[PDB]
Motif scaffolding. Structure first.
Motif, short mmCIF file in Angstrom:
data_model
loop_
_atom_site.label_atom_id
_atom_site.label_comp_id
_atom_site.label_asym_id
_atom_site.label_seq_id
_atom_site.Cartn_x
_atom_site.Cartn_y
_atom_site.Cartn_z
N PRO A 192 -6.27 5.34 8.65
CA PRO A 192 -5.16 5.22 9.59
C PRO A 192 -4.13 4.18 9.15
O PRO A 192 -4.43 3.22 8.43
N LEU A 193 -2.91 4.37 9.64
CA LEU A 193 -1.89 3.34 9.53
C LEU A 193 -2.22 2.18 10.47
O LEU A 193 -3.11 2.25 11.31
N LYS A 194 -1.47 1.08 10.30
CA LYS A 194 -1.44 -0.04 11.22
C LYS A 194 -0.36 0.20 12.27
O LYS A 194 0.69 0.77 11.97
N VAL A 195 -0.60 -0.27 13.50
CA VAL A 195 0.50 -0.36 14.46
C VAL A 195 1.54 -1.32 13.90
O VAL A 195 1.21 -2.44 13.50
N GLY A 196 2.79 -0.88 13.84
CA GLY A 196 3.85 -1.60 13.17
C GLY A 196 4.07 -1.16 11.74
O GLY A 196 5.05 -1.59 11.12
N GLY A 197 3.19 -0.31 11.19
CA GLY A 197 3.30 0.13 9.82
C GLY A 197 3.92 1.51 9.68
O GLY A 197 4.41 2.12 10.63
N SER A 198 3.92 1.99 8.44
CA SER A 198 4.59 3.24 8.11
C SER A 198 4.03 3.83 6.83
O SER A 198 3.37 3.15 6.04
N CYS A 199 4.35 5.10 6.62
CA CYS A 199 4.17 5.73 5.31
C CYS A 199 5.28 6.74 5.10
O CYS A 199 5.85 7.27 6.05
N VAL A 200 5.60 6.98 3.83
CA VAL A 200 6.58 7.98 3.44
C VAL A 200 5.85 9.24 3.02
O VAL A 200 5.02 9.22 2.11
N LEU A 201 6.18 10.35 3.67
CA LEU A 201 5.65 11.66 3.32
C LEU A 201 6.83 12.61 3.17
O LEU A 201 8.00 12.22 3.26
N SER A 202 6.52 13.88 2.91
CA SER A 202 7.58 14.86 2.76
C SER A 202 8.37 15.04 4.05
O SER A 202 7.83 14.95 5.16
N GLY A 203 9.65 15.36 3.91
CA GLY A 203 10.47 15.77 5.03
C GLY A 203 10.45 17.26 5.27
O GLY A 203 11.09 17.74 6.21
N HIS A 204 9.72 18.02 4.46
CA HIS A 204 9.56 19.47 4.65
C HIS A 204 10.94 20.11 4.72
O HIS A 204 11.79 19.82 3.87
N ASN A 205 11.19 20.96 5.70
CA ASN A 205 12.45 21.67 5.88
C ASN A 205 13.47 20.84 6.65
O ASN A 205 14.57 21.34 6.92
N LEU A 206 13.15 19.60 7.00
CA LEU A 206 14.01 18.80 7.85
C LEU A 206 14.80 17.71 7.13
O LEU A 206 15.86 17.31 7.60
N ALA A 207 14.29 17.22 6.00
CA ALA A 207 14.82 16.04 5.32
C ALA A 207 14.15 15.98 3.96
O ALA A 207 13.15 16.66 3.72
N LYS A 208 14.67 15.13 3.07
CA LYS A 208 13.95 14.90 1.83
C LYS A 208 12.59 14.27 2.11
O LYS A 208 11.55 14.76 1.65
N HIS A 209 12.59 13.19 2.89
CA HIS A 209 11.42 12.41 3.21
C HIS A 209 11.31 12.24 4.71
O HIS A 209 12.33 12.18 5.41
N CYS A 210 10.08 12.09 5.18
CA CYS A 210 9.83 11.63 6.54
C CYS A 210 9.16 10.27 6.47
O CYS A 210 8.10 10.13 5.84
N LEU A 211 9.79 9.27 7.08
CA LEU A 211 9.19 7.95 7.26
C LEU A 211 8.46 7.95 8.59
O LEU A 211 9.08 7.94 9.66
N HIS A 212 7.13 8.01 8.53
CA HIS A 212 6.29 7.97 9.73
C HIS A 212 6.11 6.51 10.10
O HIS A 212 5.50 5.75 9.34
N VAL A 213 6.64 6.10 11.25
CA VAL A 213 6.61 4.71 11.69
C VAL A 213 5.84 4.63 13.00
O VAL A 213 6.13 5.39 13.93
N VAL A 214 4.90 3.69 13.08
CA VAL A 214 4.08 3.52 14.27
C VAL A 214 4.62 2.35 15.07
O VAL A 214 4.39 1.19 14.73
N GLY A 215 5.31 2.64 16.17
CA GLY A 215 5.66 1.61 17.12
C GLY A 215 4.47 1.40 18.05
O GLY A 215 3.61 2.29 18.22
N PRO A 216 4.43 0.29 18.75
CA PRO A 216 3.38 0.10 19.76
C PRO A 216 3.52 1.10 20.91
O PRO A 216 4.62 1.39 21.37
N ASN A 217 2.38 1.61 21.37
CA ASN A 217 2.31 2.51 22.51
C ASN A 217 1.88 1.69 23.73
O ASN A 217 0.72 1.30 23.84
#
Ligand SMILES: O=C(O)[C@H]1CN(c2ncnc3[nH]c4cc(F)ccc4c23)CCC12CCC2
Length: 167
Positions: A72-97
């Motif tokens: 798992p990611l950390k709360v406050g952290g991120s990872c870069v994955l594919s953007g698929h059909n939406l963007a070059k990249h998707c930055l998955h960012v975890v804000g606090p819930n």
């Protein structure tokens, strides 16, 4: 000059629009779209569910492989994955819930991830089903992100409130 259209300029580097981030991504095809992720990259609802649905579940398939390898990611952290059909990249960012009791101070750490990218299309972190006050999220965004961020706010009523209350 970039291809983002119809945004209101809030500061030197932050722009905002009443838009569906999925439709906005489909039209602009930005270098980076930000996802409102959780630490498990389970894209069930909110912005994440909508982005994943628009990728025909390919975002989820890629994410499950990422978690199986890295945990798992950390709360406050991120990872870069594919953007698929939406963007070059998707930055998955975890804000606090807030609906999980997570510390809202981690919202600043979450927005710091945006500074690793020159230009981003993004939602307000920890807003919506993550339970934070979107006005607070916008303030933290403006006071933390130094790169060029184009914020998409789905709800028209909230968009108007964010603009009208912006200091
Ligand atoms: O923006 C908002 O008004 C809400 C909703 N969200 C989003 N923000 C931008 N684009 C979106 N597309 C979506 C499609 C969906 F099915 C569900 C949600 C979003 C969404 C996430 C939570 C917030 C951001 C501020 C509080």
């Amino acid at each position: 000059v970039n291809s983002f259209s119809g945004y209101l300029k809030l500061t030197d580097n932050v722009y905002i629009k009443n838009a569906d981030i999925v439709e906005e991504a489909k039209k602009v095809k930005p270098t980076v779209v930000v996802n409102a992720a959780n630490v498990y990259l389970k894209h069930g609802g909110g912005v994440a569910g909508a982005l994943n649905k628009a990728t025909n579940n390919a975002m989820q398939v890629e994410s499950d492989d990422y978690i199986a390898t890295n945990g798992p990611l950390k709360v406050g952290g991120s990872c870069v994955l594919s953007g698929h059909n939406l963007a070059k990249h998707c930055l998955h960012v975890v804000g606090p819930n807030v609906n999980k009791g997570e510390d809202i101070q981690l919202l600043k750490s979450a927005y710091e991830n945006f500074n690793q990218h020159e230009v981003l299309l993004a939602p307000l972190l920890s807003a919506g089903i993550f339970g934070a006050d979107p006005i607070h999220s916008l303030r933290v965004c403006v006071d933390t992100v130094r790169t060029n961020v184009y914020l998409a706010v789905f709800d028209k009523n909230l968009y108007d409130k964010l603009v009208s209350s912006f200091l």
